[PDB]
C-alpha cells in the first residue's frame, strides 16, 4: 500500500522473484529498527509491507538482498545488497514505490512517489 | 576530443571492450549520415571519433552495437543496439562523453558534457 | 497488451506523463514503417499500442519523445528521444514492457519480457 | 589506487563535484568502521581513498552523500544517500571503480572491477 518494492532483473528482462527485502526505520535514537520485510512475488513486487497508519514519517531503509538473488542464479554479484535510504512522509503521507533494477555489477533504484 | 564514448558492462563489472560504435549526423533530408565509428578500447572507451572542426552543431546519433557485444559473451540481449541521439549545442563545445551502461535487458546512457 | 511502454521521471520521482511514444517496425525492405503511437497516461504507462495478432515477429523501434517531455518542464535535455530497438517475438509471442527512466542527461531503458 | 569513486549527475550531465563520500569497512561485530572519505573532484572522481596494503578483503560500504549534493543544487532529493556495499575479493585485487549516476529520485551504481 504506501510502500511497495519492485525488483527487476536486467540480465533476464524479468521480475526478480523471491528477492528478500528488509525495511528498517531509523529510531530516535539513530538505530535502524526492523520495520517490515518480505519477498518479491513472481511479478517482482512486494506489497503489503506496511500500512498508512504504521508508515509514519521517518527515515527508512529498504534493504534488497540482491546478493542472494544473484547467487541463487549462479552469479557472484558485486553488491551485498541494494539499500535505499529515504525520508518518508516528510510533507504528508505518500505512496512509495521503490524500484530496483538489478545487474550483477550494477543496480539502479528509483523512487516513484505519489500522492493519494 | 569533443566526443567520447564510454561503455560499461553491468553484468561483468568491466569496461565493455570491443564494442562497435557508429556515429551519425543527421543530414538536411533527415537521413543519418555516417560520421565516425570505432570500437571501444580495453578501457571501454572510444576516443578520436571526431575533432572540434568537424564536430559542428547538429543532431548526432551514436549507435552502440550492444547486441554483438552480448552475442560475443554468450548472453541473450534484448536490444538490437543502444542509440543515443542528441543535438550538439547551442551554445558551442564542450566535450561530450556518452556513457553507456549495458545489461542484457537494460541500458542506460548518460551524457557528461563539460566546458 | 503485448507491448506496453512505461516512463518514469527520475528528477520528480513520478510517472512521466503525456510522453509521446512512437513505435515502428522494420519492414522487409529495411525501412521503419509506423506501427503505433500513443502518449503515456498519468501513470506513465502507454497501453493498447497493439494486439497479439498485429504484434508479429519483427524488429521494433519504440521512440520516446523525452525531449518534448523535458522541454515542457523547462529543461533543455541532452537526448532528442529515447529509442529502444529490439527483436520481438523471435521465439514466440511475449509481452514486452518497455520501461524508460528519464533524467535530463540520462536515460535508462529496461525490457521486461514475459510469457503468457 | 585500488578503490575509486566516480559520481555523475544525470540532471546536469556533468561530473557530480564535491560530493562527500565515506567508505566504511565492516568490523568483526558487524558495525561500519570509517575507513576513508573524500569529496569528488572537478571530474566527479575521488581517488586516494586507500592503498593496496590497507584495502584488505572485507565488506566495504561506500556512502555517497547524494542528498547534500542535490541540496546544494536546489533540487529535492529522494535518498538520504547512495550506499554501495560490497565484498572486496576473493580473489585478490583488482581495482574498483564505484560509479554512481545520480538523479534526484534515482541512482545507479556500478562497479568496474579491473585486473
Curated annotation (Swiss-Prot), chains B, D:
The modification Sulfocysteine is found at residue 1. Changing residue 38 to V: In AMYLD1; amyloid polyneuropathy with carpal tunnel syndrome. Keywords: Amyloid, Amyloidosis, Cytoplasm, Disease variant, Gamma-carboxyglutamic acid, Glycoprotein, Hormone, Neuropathy, Phosphoprotein, Secreted, Signal, Sulfation, Thyroid hormone, Transport. Its main location: secreted. Changing residue 41 to R: In AMYLD1; amyloid polyneuropathy. Changing residue 26 to N: In AMYLD1; amyloid polyneuropathy. One of its GO terms (cellular component) is extracellular exosome. Changing residue 43 to P: In AMYLD1; amyloid polyneuropathy. Belongs to the transthyretin family. This is Transthyretin. The chain holds residues 30 to 144 of 147 of the full protein.
